Design an enzyme around this catalytic site. Structure first.
Site, mmCIF file in Angstrom:
data_model
loop_
_atom_site.group_PDB
_atom_site.id
_atom_site.type_symbol
_atom_site.label_atom_id
_atom_site.label_comp_id
_atom_site.label_asym_id
_atom_site.label_seq_id
_atom_site.Cartn_x
_atom_site.Cartn_y
_atom_site.Cartn_z
ATOM 1 N N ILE A 150 0.845 -1.201 0.000
ATOM 2 C CA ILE A 150 0.000 0.000 0.000
ATOM 3 C C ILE A 150 0.883 1.254 0.000
ATOM 4 C CG2 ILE A 150 -1.702 1.372 1.303
ATOM 5 C CD1 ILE A 150 -2.659 -1.405 2.486
ATOM 6 N N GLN A 176 2.355 1.884 -3.459
ATOM 7 C CA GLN A 176 1.390 2.389 -4.424
ATOM 8 C C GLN A 176 1.071 3.845 -4.134
ATOM 9 O OE1 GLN A 176 0.073 1.543 -7.277
ATOM 10 N NE2 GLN A 176 -1.250 3.356 -7.323
ATOM 11 N N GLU A 177 1.047 4.211 -2.852
ATOM 12 C CA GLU A 177 0.655 5.577 -2.464
ATOM 13 C C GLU A 177 1.755 6.625 -2.683
ATOM 14 O OE1 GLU A 177 -2.247 6.608 -1.880
ATOM 15 O OE2 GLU A 177 -3.479 5.060 -0.987
ATOM 16 N N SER A 178 2.989 6.300 -2.294
ATOM 17 C CA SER A 178 4.051 7.306 -2.269
ATOM 18 C C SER A 178 5.374 6.846 -2.887
ATOM 19 C CB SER A 178 4.311 7.749 -0.824
ATOM 20 O OG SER A 178 4.836 6.683 -0.044
#
Length: 420
Positions: free
Chosen positions: A275, A278-280
């Protein structure tokens, strides 16, 4: 009826260019602009949605209808005393849109003999009506049951030959429809404007133009334009070589945080790390024009809810974002079992529980299994099609991007698990 009552009624349409629900609630260019106006007047904003443009204007024209329409409208019917327009707040140019590789029309006359569809009640339909006076063999279709996103989809897949939309709508949607192209510009550049009722009580429109003038000089309109135009939404899959490079350089810095969170929440730390990637791309200082910050890309509201005082701190971001994910997962209907359960939680992390439930209801109505990710994933893209999303409680969402989000995270998770 506003301050003495406390409530500003604004009518709009449900669309990615104007107003829609995301995981944080209400959002959109028109929504935020109208929200800032409401605050300036010191009143509460209440959004109403019209089913279509004829409906929008008809409500606006009623005695005691909404105060104004904020809906990407073009000043038109300059004699329709029932409606008056504000100063403009965004310059757009209407454009004929065709499918890449097909024959490109270059002049108005080339539109004859093609299948064209536009929104019913739009200024673009009126352009075509005017053009039809000069070229009576021109034919076009207009519908109340589609939005601009649907028109672009139809060109993209070849259900229609052409459409006519404003340049801002293309700018926002272009990336999602790889095949569509501008054939040519049809009409002079014009400003978008809010619409207010006729036409005696000058009070509100004085306020509106003063607000818009200040919003411009103060740069709000530019910051709104940057936030809503040019943004990526969900980061594309980075590929094997880039992921390993970040596996090598970035993950070791945060690995201990992911594991501790994984232990405290009794969940696989590599899913948490996936996660975060994918986010940062594992960048604790990452920021967005959309109001999210940090390794897990948290909003202020979610950060505060999760006990995060500093979104830029990698440890706090990882702990808060992880807690949010596990909480979402824990709150799903008991009928959804692992491993689907985790995939649904990933979907909800991105799109919000409300849109995800709309997608599950749609799957069930379709005869599919609302507890299987493989089935519900097929429904999410429909949330971007008005024929489907207008039937849902929470309306439009770019559902296909949520599908990408989940697929990306699962791929990163699989790789992390393999490299152990």
């Amino acid at each position: 009826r506003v301050q003495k009552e406390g409530v500003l009624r604004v009518i709009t349409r449900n669309s990615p260019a104007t107003y829609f629900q995301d995981r944080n609630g209400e959002t959109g260019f028109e929504y935020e602009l109208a929200k800032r106006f409401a605050e300036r007047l010191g009143v509460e904003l209440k959004i109403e949605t019209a089913d279509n443009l004829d409906d929008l204007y008809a409500q606006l024209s009623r005695e005691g209808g909404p105060a104004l329409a904020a809906a990407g409208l073009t000043p038109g019917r300059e004699d329709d005393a029932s409606v008056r327009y504000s100063h403009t707040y965004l310059d757009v140019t209407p454009q004929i849109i065709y499918r890449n590789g097909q024959q490109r029309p270059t002049r108005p006359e080339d539109l004859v003999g093609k299948r064209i569809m536009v929104l019913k009640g739009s200024s673009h339909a009126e352009q075509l009506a005017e053009l039809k006076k000069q070229y009576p063999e021109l034919k076009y279709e207009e519908s109340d049951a589609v939005e601009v996103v649907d028109l672009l989809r139809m060109v993209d897949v070849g259900d229609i030959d052409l459409t006519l939309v404003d340049s801002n709508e293309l700018a926002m949607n272009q990336v999602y429809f790889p095949n569509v192209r501008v054939a040519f510009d049809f009409g002079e550049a014009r400003g978008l404007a809010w619409a207010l009722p006729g036409g005696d009580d000058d009070s509100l429109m004085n306020e509106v133009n003063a607000f818009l003038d200040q919003a411009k000089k103060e740069g709000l309109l530019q910051r709104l334009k940057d936030r809503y135009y040019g943004h990526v939404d969900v980061l594309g899959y980075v590929g094997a070589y880039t992921f390993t490079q970040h596996l090598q350089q970035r993950l070791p810095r945060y690995e201990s945080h992911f594991k501790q969170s994984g232990k405290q929440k009794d969940t696989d730390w590599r899913l948490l790390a996936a996660i975060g990637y994918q986010e940062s791309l594992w960048q604790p200082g990452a920021t967005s024009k959309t109001g999210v910050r940090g390794l897990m890309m948290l909003t202020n509201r979610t950060a505060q809810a999760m006990g995060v005082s500093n979104r830029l701190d990698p440890k706090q971001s990882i702990q808060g974002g992880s807690k949010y994910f596990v909480q979402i997962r824990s709150e799903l209907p008991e009928s959804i079992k692992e491993p689907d359960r985790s995939w649904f939680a990933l979907a909800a992390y991105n799109i919000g529980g409300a849109h995800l439930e709309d997608a599950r209801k749609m799957a069930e109505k379709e005869g599919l299994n609302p507890n299987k990710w493989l089935d519900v994933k097929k429904m999410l893209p429909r949330l971007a099609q008005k024929q489907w999303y207008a039937k849902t409680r929470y309306g439009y969402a770019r559902g296909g991007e949520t599908v990408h989000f989940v697929q990306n995270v699962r791929r990163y998770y699989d790789i992390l698990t393999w490299v152990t």
